[PDB]
């Protein structure tokens, strides 16, 4: 049946090439021999045998077989290398996680400078991302690695979230110790810069706000190399963490340690004054310092900016293809 994963062989796919390098193996583009569908194969190598099958892949299998949303990437099956016949110990062949093939990734489209986003294209982008983030948050899962490279958009204007290698369940009642450094420094939330370690789903919302701002400038907002410099850049824009706006900042491990140059005032609305009013309000609420005052995924979907977007009107981004040469 369709559900008997791990047995079908990777012979069934014609490998087109290597689309990218992942965490637990390389990612390849491939065509299914039977259907002609294009797939993306993530290679999982347990040959290292340091600690066996990688947990990053275990998370992505465990969670993505549970999550069924248009804006969440779909794992179709898990296939294997030709296994050694009647010799299970010597078998070092790897496993492949089959996904749908998405035409492009956001970082590539922006780094190459080949995308222009109108307000209406940003509306369709964010409604899908937040709707899928909402779906995940309603299911009590945190992504913990929202970057532009984990947002896949195909030319049809459909957005899908993808690298769940760091996803774990969140319980509001049961506070649990979690890994401090989770989201990429450019998109890292302020609380994790101070090391909350018991963070809320709001961490993902901060990353998406960073994307929201980035889509309006085409340049990431908080570009730093070190955790302190990042807190400085965030502070120059959002204001310095202080009990006046974040009463519990005093509870954070590095609060007294990582002071910014000044106690800056918030200028987010001034430095982003070129943004439409409905959007600017969304950015201000998503880039709120205190995670308990930062808006939820649902609240962004009930905003003037996203509330009245019809997903029938996908409005694909302006991707130049001809005349890019001349």
């Amino acid at each position: 049946t369709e559900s008997d994963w791990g047995k079908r062989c990777v012979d069934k796919f014609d490998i087109i090439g290597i689309i990218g390098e992942g965490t637990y193996g390389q990612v390849y583009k491939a065509k299914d021999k039977d259907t002609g569908e294009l797939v993306a194969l993530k290679k999982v190598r347990l040959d290292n045998e340091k600690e066996g099958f990688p947990i990053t892949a275990i998370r992505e299998i465990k969670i993505l077989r549970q999550l069924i949303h248009r804006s969440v990437v779909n794992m179709k099956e898990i296939v294997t290398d030709k296994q050694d016949a009647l010799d299970f110990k010597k078998d070092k062949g790897a496993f492949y996680l089959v996904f749908e093939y998405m035409d492009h990734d956001l970082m590539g489209l922006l780094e190459s400078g080949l995308v222009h986003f109108s307000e209406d294209h940003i509306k369709s982008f964010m409604k899908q991302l937040m709707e899928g983030l909402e779906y995940c948050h309603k299911k009590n899962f945190l992504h913990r690695d929202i970057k532009c490279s984990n947002i896949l958009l195909n030319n049809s204007g459909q957005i899908k979230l993808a690298d769940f290698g760091l996803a774990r369940l969140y319980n509001s009642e049961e506070s649990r110790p979690y890994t401090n450094k989770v989201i990429t420094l450019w998109y890292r939330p302020p609380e994790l810069l101070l090391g909350e370690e018991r963070y809320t789903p709001a961490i993902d919302v901060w990353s998406c706000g960073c994307i929201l701002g980035e889509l309006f400038t085409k340049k990431p907002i908080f570009q730093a190399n070190l955790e302190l410099a990042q807190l400085e850049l965030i502070s120059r824009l959002c204001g310095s963490p202080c009990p006046a706006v974040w009463p519990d900042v005093i509870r954070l491990p590095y609060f007294n340690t990582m002071k910014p140059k000044k106690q800056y005032r918030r200028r987010l609305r001034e430095e982003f004054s070129f943004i439409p009013s409905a959007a600017l309000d969304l950015l201000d609420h998503m880039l709120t310092l205190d995670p308990s005052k930062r808006c939820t995924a649902e609240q962004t979907l009930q905003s003037d900016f996203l509330k009245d977007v019809e997903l029938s009107k996908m409005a694909p981004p302006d991707l130049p293809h001809w005349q890019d040469c001349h």
Partner: protein
């Protein structure tokens, strides 16, 4: 989409183990020993109850596709617990599972691990994953015992006695093939039902529908008493054959 992980009691007469000449009593004994091995090892390691149960459900499922005569059970058990730890985010190093296994197992039993215990377990991970068809998410009677108990309102002390007694039954049902016959939701109800009969409690009074004598039907739709009694019979038989008596 998703695989079916529940069989009928009559089907257990045809596990690989049975067809290689193992009798029903022996396979049942092997299942109890392998599960209790998983439980005790993880308890020493400080593992969450869900992690222990997940390993057991993997273990029980595994020997629905393979024979106990070709796959030594304590190696299988150790592997299941090792994977369960990663699945449930309570990870342990394989060397630490082997260490605890050595303490709890006698020399003959630890012989199953062969000359290199850690390797034999790590190798089996490939087979385990293919056997469970990479369906790693598992639900356990515990969550439903607490979700349903939260909706009961009444004497704080009578309900807590019901829950703890039912909890002990859930732990004991893991040593049985019930995990492979009935969904966890039914198990949680069955253990509430059992604890109720023994404690002379009438659970319907604690529900929002106090004159609905089949109290469970608001929690688990379509469950006949036939099923709940079958489950209760199986759990109590484990207490009668063993020395232990009802928890009270």
């Amino acid at each position: 989409t998703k695989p079916c992980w529940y069989w009928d009691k009559k089907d257990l007469a045809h596990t690989p183990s049975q067809l290689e000449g193992l009798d029903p009593a022996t396979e049942a004994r092997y299942r109890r020993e392998g599960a209790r091995f998983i439980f005790d090892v993880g308890t020493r390691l400080g593992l969450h109850y869900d992690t222990l149960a997940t390993g057991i459900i993997y273990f029980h499922r595994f020997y629905m596709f393979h024979s106990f005569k070709q796959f030594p059970r304590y190696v299988t058990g150790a592997c299941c617990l090792f994977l369960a730890g990663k699945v449930e985010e309570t990870p342990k190093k394989c060397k630490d599972i082997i260490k605890t296994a050595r303490s709890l197992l006698n020399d003959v039993q630890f012989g199953q691990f062969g000359d290199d215990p850690k390797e034999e377990v790590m190798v089996l991970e490939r087979i385990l994953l293919q056997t469970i068809k990479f369906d790693l998410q598992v639900e356990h009677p515990y969550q439903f015992l607490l979700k349903y108990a939260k909706q009961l309102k009444g004497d704080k002390n009578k309900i807590q006695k019901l829950v703890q007694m039912a909890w002990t039954f859930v732990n004991d049902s893991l040593c049985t093939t019930l995990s492979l016959q009935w969904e966890p939701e039914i198990i949680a109800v069955a253990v509430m039902y059992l604890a109720g009969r023994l404690c002379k409690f009438e659970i319907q009074e604690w529900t929002s529908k106090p004159m609905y004598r089949r109290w469970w039907e608001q929690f688990v739709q379509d469950v006949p008493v036939d099923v709940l009694e079958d489950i209760c019979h199986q759990i109590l038989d484990l207490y009668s054959q063993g020395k232990q008596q009802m928890p009270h």
